Amino acid sequence: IKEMIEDFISKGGLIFTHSGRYTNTNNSCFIFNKNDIGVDTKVDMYTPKSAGIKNEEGENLWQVLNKANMFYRIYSGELGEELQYLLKS
DNA sequence: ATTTAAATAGGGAAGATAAGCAAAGGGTTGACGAAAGCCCTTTGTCCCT
């Protein structure tokens, strides 16, 4: 999923768990919390115009990153530092 | 204006079953998009001659 991670970081590409776009659309205020991520915490992601890339199944990065608790699995660092550094950046 | 007070209201048995509750048709349309790129303009800012 590195070929989709670098594509999302080549775009605007922000990841948050607290935003203000759910109240007013013209906000663009994004907050990521460090003390709230757990074993089932789901996060959201923003890029301009919601541009994405499939994975030869019909899934973007958001559909991959929330299924089977993958975000904690890259976040805790059990998949190596090759993708954990890209996730932390 | 006056006009009475006491005693008591029954026990029993039943309250029917059979049949069926239609069929087609339809259920509106129009407004309520941010981020980025591109040219054009109108006015701060320094200039000379």
**Distance measured from the CA of protein residue A24 to the C1' of nucleotide B45, in angstroms:** 40
Q: Alpha-carbon distance A86 to A45, whole Å? A: 15
The distance (Å) linking the CA of A17 with the C1' of B11 is 86
Q: φ and ψ at A30, to 5 degrees?
A: -130, 130
Measured in angstroms, what separates residue A71's CA from nucleotide B31's C1'?
A: 42
Taking the C-alpha atoms of residue A40 and residue A70, their distance in angstroms, rounded to an integer, is 10
Q: Could you say which nucleotides of strand B lie within 7 A of any protein CB atom?
A: 33-36
Tell how far CA A42 is from the center of its chain.
9
Report which of A7, A68, A24, A80 is spatially closest to residue A42, judged by C-alpha positions: A68
* Half-sphere exposure in the Cβ direction for A49 (13 Å, CA): 4
The method of structure determination was cryo-EM
Dist. CA A20–CA A28, nearest whole Å? 7
